[PDB]
């Protein structure tokens, strides 16, 4: 038999992030688990998958990508649970 | 038999990040687990998978990528749970 | 029999990062586990997998990549849980 | 029988990073575990896998890569849990 | 029988990094464990695996790689857990 037990006896105030997966057995994607606890911050996709036969003949492409500007990412305890703690963001 | 036991007896206030996986047995992706606890910060994808036969003939491409600008990433305790602690971001 | 026991008796306030995997038995990717606790910071992918027959004939490509600018990555305790500790980011 | 026991008796406040794996038995990737606790900081991939027959004939490529700019990576206790400690980032 | 026991009796506050693996029995990669505790800092990959038949005929390639700029990597206790210690980054 297959028995999976997680956190059966929890008495006092834990701060938990639980992810349990149990198994039993142009772009192709099948039978997967992706990004259970995923945090994407300032992630840029410019040209992902244009198509079949793009810019086939006599293509004059001027691709200019400029990501240069005042951006502030102030994060306290990302993906970090806590208890009996003090988290503060002061500006 | 297959028995997996994780954190059965938890009494007082732990700060935990739990990931349990139990097994039993152009781009192709099958039967995988990806990014259970994944943090991507300032990750850039410019040309991922344009397609089949791109820029096939007489292609004049000027690809210029400039990522150069004022950006501040201030993170306290990323992927780090805590208890009875003090986390502070002061600017 | 296959028995795996992890952290059965936890009494007082640990700060833990748990990853348990139990086994039983152009691009191709199958039957894998990737990035359980993965932190990617300022990771750049310019040309990942353009396609089949790209820039096939008479290609004049000027690829210029410039990643040179004011960026600050201030992280305290990345992938490091703690308890009874003091973490502070002061600017 | 196969018995694996890890951290069965935990009484007081440890700061732990646990990774347990139990076994039982163009690009091809199968049946692997990658990056359980992986931290990538300023890792650059310019041309990973363009495709089949790229720049096949009469290719005039000027590849210029410049990664030269003011970047500060200030990290305290990366992949290092602690307890009863003091971690501080002061600027 | 196969018995593996790790850290069975833990009483007071250790700062530990645990990795336990138990066995039982163009590019090809199969049945491996990679980067359990891996830290990559300023690691550059320019041309990893372009493809089959790249730059096949009459290729005029000017590859220039310049990684020369002001970058500071200030790390305290990378992959080094501690307890009853003081870690400080002061600038």
Angle at B66 between CA B61 and CA B70, to 5 degrees: 165
C vs D: CB pairs below 8 A: 329
C2, two tokens: 């296959």
How remote is the C-alpha of D22 from its chain's centroid? 21
Angle at E17 between CA E24 and CA A14, to 5 degrees: 105
CB atoms within 10 A of CB A20: 17
The three-state secondary structure class of A36 is coil
Give the distance from residue C32's alpha carbon to the nearest chain B alpha carbon, in angstroms: 5
Residues 6+ apart with CB under 8 A from C24: B2, B23, B24, B25, C2, D24
Let me know if chains B and E touch, i.e. at least 3 Cβ pairs under 8 angstroms.
Answer: no
Task: Answer whether C12's CB lies under 8 Å from D13's CB.
Answer: yes
Q: Which residues are A10's β-sheet partners?
A: B10
Whose tokens are 């003081």? That residue is E86
Strands A37-41 and E37-41: unpaired
Give buried/exposed letters for C59-69 (b at 16+ CB in 10 A, else e): bebebbbbbbb
Task: Answer whether A88's CB lies under 8 Å from B89's CB.
Answer: yes
Task: Answer whether A50's CB lies under 8 Å from B56's CB.
Answer: no
Task: Answer whether D18's CB lies under 8 Å from D79's CB.
Answer: no
Task: Answer whether B16's CB lies under 8 Å from C13's CB.
Answer: no
This structure's resolution (Å) is: 3.4
Q: Which chains touch C (3 or more CB pairs under 8 A)?
A: A, B, D, E
Task: Answer whether D83's CB lies under 8 Å from D68's CB.
Answer: no
B37: nearest Cα among C14, D55, C16: C16
Contacts of D51 in chain B (CB under 8 A): 26
Residue A80, annotated as binding a ligand? no
Rounded Cα distance between B32 and A30, Å, is 9
D35, two tokens: 């990056």
Residues 6+ apart with CB under 8 A from A6: A18, A20, B6, B7, B18, B20
Distances from the Cα of B33 to the Cαs of A3, A43, D85, E18, E27, in angstroms? Answer: 21, 21, 35, 22, 21
Rounded Cα distance between B13 and B83, Å, is 7
Residue D85, annotated as binding a ligand? yes
What domains can you pick out in chain E, each with its CATH number?
1-91 (2.60.40.180)
Closest chain C residue to B5, measured at CA: C5
Whose tokens are 């992280």? That residue is C75
From the list E2, E29, E77, which residue is nearest D80 (CB)?
Answer: E77
Rounded Cα distance between A83 and B3, Å, is 30
Q: CB distance D21–E21 less than 8 Å?
A: yes
Rounded Cα distance between B27 and D68, Å, is 33
Rounded Cα distance between E59 and D62, Å, is 11
E3, two tokens: 């018995």
Closest chain B residue to C87, measured at CA: B87
Q: CB distance B71–A66 less than 8 Å?
A: no
Q: Cite the DSSP H helix spans in A1-91.
A: none
Give the distance from residue A35's alpha carbon to the nearest chain C alpha carbon, in angstroms: 10
The sheet carrying C2-6 orders its strands as A2-6, B2-6, C2-6, D2-6, E2-6
Tell me chain A's radius of gyration from C-alpha atoms. 23
Closest chain A residue to B53, measured at CA: A53
Contacts of C84 in chain E (CB under 8 A): 13
Q: Which residues are D80's β-sheet partners?
A: none
- Surface-to-core class of residue A85, CB atoms within 10 Å of its CB (0-12 exposed, 13-18 middle, 19+ buried): buried
Rounded Cα distance between E21 and D24, Å, is 11
From the list E4, E29, E47, which residue is nearest D4 (CB)?
Answer: E4
Q: Which residues are C26's β-sheet partners?
A: none
D44, two tokens: 């650059």
- Surface-to-core class of residue A30, CB atoms within 10 Å of its CB (0-12 exposed, 13-18 middle, 19+ buried): exposed
Closest chain A residue to B6, measured at CA: A6
Angle at C31 between CA C29 and CA C32, to 5 degrees: 80
Distances from the Cα of E80 to the Cαs of A19, B4, D69, E42, in angstroms? Answer: 27, 29, 29, 20
Rounded Cα distance between C85 and E84, Å, is 9
Tell me chain D's radius of gyration from C-alpha atoms. 23
Q: Which residues are C30's β-sheet partners?
A: B30, D30
Q: CB distance B66–A69 less than 8 Å?
A: no
Q: What is the 8-class DSSP label of residue E82?
A: E
Q: Which chains touch D (3 or more CB pairs under 8 A)?
A: B, C, E
Summarize the annotated binding site of E as residue ranges. Answer: 5, 85
Rounded Cα distance between A44 and B71, Å, is 15
Closest chain E residue to D17, measured at CA: E17
Closest chain D residue to C3, measured at CA: D3
Residues 6+ apart with CB under 8 A from A16: A7, A81, B14, B15, B16, B17, B18
Rounded Cα distance between E15 and D83, Å, is 7
From the list C68, C80, C84, which residue is nearest E69 (CB)?
Answer: C68
Rounded Cα distance between C1 and D1, Å, is 5
CB atoms within 10 A of CB D49: 24
Angle at D74 between CA B90 and CA D68, to 5 degrees: 125
- Candidates C45, C51, C52, C76: best to mutate against A (most CBs of A within 10 A) is C51
The three-state secondary structure class of D54 is coil
A vs C: CB pairs below 8 A: 4
C80: nearest Cα among D71, D11, E39: E39
Give the distance from residue D61's alpha carbon to the nearest chain E alpha carbon, in angstroms: 5
Whose tokens are 């700019």? That residue is D69
Task: Answer whether D3's CB lies under 8 Å from B2's CB.
Answer: no
Task: Answer whether D63's CB lies under 8 Å from C60's CB.
Answer: no
Q: CB distance C81–D81 less than 8 Å?
A: yes
């Amino acid at each position: 038999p297959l028995m999976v037990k997680v956190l059966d006896a929890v008495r006092g105030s834990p701060a938990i992030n639980v992810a349990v997966h149990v198994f039993r057995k142009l772009t192709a994607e099948e039978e997967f688990v992706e990004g259970i606890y995923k945090v994407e911050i300032d992630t840029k996709s410019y040209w992902k998958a244009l198509g079949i036969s793009p810019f086939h003949e006599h293509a004059e492409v001027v691709f200019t990508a400029n990501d240069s500007g005042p951006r502030r990412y102030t994060i306290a305890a990302l993906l970090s649970p806590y208890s009996y703690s003090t988290t503060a963001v002061v500006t």
